[PDB]
Design a protein around this ligand. Structure first.
Ligand code: NA
Length: 754
């Protein structure tokens, strides 16, 4: 491929990043996209350093600060984008063009050139600048000289001689992986279009192949659909999105050319659309539990990341077989249609607007989020859905860090892996509406927590430490899931707790046992900590109402249930006191992220908790949550033994769902929970239908070669579906012995016949 092929690729890239070929005349959403483009460009131009012999390009960005160097470059690429977008205010404006060129030239002279050593964050030099500089070169190809291309290409190549690797020489260079590999390859591919370098282009394309190979450890995509970046942090929703976005753009760019991505194993990445991304998308938002430190970002939210994912999936759907294209389109149309809270078109780019308009013109109908369970054992995450709700559980374990903090972001997030229960609902802004600026980071919903104050960045940055726990894991059979977490508290308090969740199609049963700590502080378990926005939502009880006054904690009478207006129901499954607090909290994004705004946000919360006291000995809890339940349904939860606690202690935790005729259990030690037993750690869900026993089982440590169940509901003589060896114990009970070697926490389904 020569000059014409390179020109066509450059033109395609500019088409893609400007939407110049797809603007619909007189369309109001296109006009809005152009207005947003114009306002950003105007803002940057207003900040241009005009001074003779200038030492920065923008008056508010120092080239001596690597993040501000990146922003210098991304403003220049944005201005170049505007300059290249028909009907933009600065479209074809030669004065603006000259300013962009002089900015690229001076930033090169002053800072970013082939003689400069990296200072500060590697990512700035190797990903932030190259992608933006490469885009600017391509956008400005007709306008830059050969000498300018040589200079800029030389600078990029100096920092990124090989996009399969990362870090400056003084550090020792390592293999780039996941999102980082995609981003490095993007920068080199675009730079290779500007410089017409097929050798660099081919190598960078070949570099994409590693990112979608299945892994069983480290970073990447796991066969269960989990995605990890930074070794220990569930990351589908932020780094996984970066991967998704970059591959969408690169695949589209190269498709049909001499440089097309042709590796057939890319099927694994396509499989990840539904296997990895879709289950953690909730009405247009990526679940907070899979977006790591980005929760602390006021302007990189679950909806920002979900919108990027939707853009990427739409772009990839264009190349798919008809059935897959239509399925992906339907998924996106649903995530778009259900999201009235941050509509995707508000502040959308021209490209994003075009893809959304193209989707609408297909007439592909919106696909509903399926009810039921999606388990991700490799990343200690589970998702559960029923009509009107999605529960996301956030665990941690000897595989998965309590949290990621880094670069001044999420330093206070140390309890976010302590068994959080995120109940997403039609309150689309629950976790988005300054939740992370105002919430009590020591009382996050669902957690058990030692009230000892912890310092910012406790346990270290970048997920370097993980809890030395027994196990965290899950299984599910049909409409019921069993999830367990041995919580080890961060900050060496010695907090220990056994937390389990038993999740049906409607209600979540939450059991806790064996709770103690070494710190001498009180331990709490948080039934909920729920953003009311500016509302005064009523907490109804058997007797009347509770916590009507902000700031005065009250203890629930003895009816055992509370209903929160606009949410649903909570009910206690033991006789423990339920403390109920209506509170107003304040905070700024700057308190949770070094880049956050100083603006103070003020939010109302309902805070429901159990207090285990000081020095608990085998403390425990038992309660349920019924999202979307009416006051009348709430009042009835505890009637008729619908949610039958079987056992809740240091050996096992188990509940039977009466209506569903299904029983769920977690096992910590060998023993029995009712008529079900296990020989070691296990998650089990079972249900008898006449003369047939259905079971789901996981071995949640991920390290045991075998597991033996002692079977419920009488004797069982043959295996109908699945694998396993039937036996008989000393007491005459049927046993099922499973080979669990290498199962990585995955579920085995078994059906037995009487
Ligand atoms: Na890590």
């Amino acid at each position: 491929p020569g000059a014409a092929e390179f020109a066509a690729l450059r033109n395609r890239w500019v088409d893609q990043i400007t939407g110049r070929n797809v603007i619909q005349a007189g369309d109001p959403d296109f006009a809005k996209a152009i207005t947003a483009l114009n306002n950003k460009a105007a803002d940057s131009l207003a900040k241009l350093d005009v001074k003779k012999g200038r030492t920065s390009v923008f008056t508010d960005l120092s080239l001596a600060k690597d993040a501000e160097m990146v922003t210098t470059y991304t403003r220049l690429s944005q201005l170049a984008t505007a300059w290249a977008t028909p009907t933009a205010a600065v479209f074809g404006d030669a004065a603006v063009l000259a300013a962009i060129k002089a900015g690229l030239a001076d930033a090169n002279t002053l800072c970013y050139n082939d003689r400069k050593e990296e200072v500060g964050n590697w990512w700035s030099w190797e990903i932030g600048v190259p992608r933006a500089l490469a885009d600017a070169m391509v956008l400005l190809h007709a306008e830059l000289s050969a000498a300018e291309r040589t200079a800029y290409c030389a600078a990029i190549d100096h920092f990124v001689p090989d996009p399969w690797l990362q870090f400056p020489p003084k550090r020792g260079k390592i293999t780039s992986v996941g999102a980082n590999r995609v981003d490095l390859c993007q920068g080199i591919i675009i730079r290779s279009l500007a410089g017409e370098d097929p050798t660099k282009l081919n190598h960078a394309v070949a570099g994409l192949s590693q990112v979608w190979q299945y892994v069983t450890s480290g970073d990447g995509i796991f066969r269960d659909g989990s995605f990890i970046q930074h070794s220990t942090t569930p990351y589908t929703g932020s780094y996984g999105v970066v991967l998704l976005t970059g591959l969408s753009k690169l695949f589209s760019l190269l498709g049909g050319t001499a440089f097309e991505v042709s590796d057939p194993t890319r099927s694994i990445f396509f499989d990840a659309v539904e296997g990895s991304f879709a289950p953690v998308m909730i009405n247009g938002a990526m679940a907070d539990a899979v977006r790591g430190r980005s929760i602390s970002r006021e302007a990189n939210t679950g909806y920002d990341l979900g919108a990027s994912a939707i853009e990427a999936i739409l772009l990839l759907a264009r190349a798919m077989d008809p059935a897959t294209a239509a399925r992906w389109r339907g998924l996106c149309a649903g995530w778009i249609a259900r999201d009235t809270y941050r509509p995707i078109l508000n502040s959308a780019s021209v490209p994003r607007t075009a893809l959304v308009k193209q989707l609408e013109a297909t007439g592909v109908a919106p696909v509903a989020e399926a009810t039921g369970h999606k388990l991700f054992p490799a990343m200690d995450r589970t998702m559960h859905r029923g009509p009107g709700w999605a529960l996301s559980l956030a665990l941690s374990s000897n595989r998965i860090a309590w949290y990621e903090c880094g670069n001044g972001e999420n330093n206070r997030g140390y309890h976010t892996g302590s068994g959080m229960t995120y109940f997403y609902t039609s309150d689309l802004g629950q976790y988005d509406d300054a939740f992370w600026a105002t919430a009590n980071y020591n009382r996050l919903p669902g957690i058990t927590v030692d009230t000892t104050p912890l310092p910012d960045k406790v346990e270290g940055q970048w997920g370097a430490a993980v809890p030395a726990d027994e196990w965290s894991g899950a299984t599910a059979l049909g409409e019921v899931a069993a999830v367990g977490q041995h919580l080890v508290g961060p900050g060496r308090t010695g907090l220990t707790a056994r937390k389990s969740w038993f999740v049906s199609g409607d209600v979540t049963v939450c059991l806790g046992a064996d709770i103690s700590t070494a710190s001498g502080a009180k331990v709490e378990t948080i039934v909920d900590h729920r953003n009311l926005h500016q509302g005064s939502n009523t907490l109804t009880t058997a007797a009347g109402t509770i916590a009507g006054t902000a700031g005065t904690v009250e203890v629930l009478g003895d009816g055992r249930w509370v209903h929160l207006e606009g949410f649903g129901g909570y009910a206690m499954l033991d006789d423990s006191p339920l403390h109920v607090l209506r509170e107003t909290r304040s905070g700024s994004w700057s308190g949770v992220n070094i880049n956050g705004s100083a603006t103070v946000q003020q939010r109302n919360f309902a805070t429901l908790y159990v207090n285990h006291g000081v020095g608990p000995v085998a403390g425990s809890y038992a309660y349920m949550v019924a999202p979307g339940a009416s006051v009348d349904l709430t009042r009835k939860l505890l009637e008729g033994n619908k949610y039958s606690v079987i056992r809740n202690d240091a050996t096992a935790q188990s509940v039977e769902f009466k209506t569903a005729k299904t029983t769920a259990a977690t096992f910590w030690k060998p023993g029995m929970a009712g008529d079900l037993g296990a020989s070691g750690p296990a998650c089990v869900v079972f249900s008898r239908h006449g003369n047939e026993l259905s079971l789901a089982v996981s071995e949640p440590t991920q390290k045991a070669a075998g597991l033996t169940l002692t079977l419920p509901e009488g004797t069982w003589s043959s295996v109908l579906e699945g694998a396993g060896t039937l036996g008989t114990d000393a007491d005459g009970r049927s046993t099922l012995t499973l080979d669990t070697t290498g199962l990585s926490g995955k579920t085995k389904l078994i059906k037995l016949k009487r």
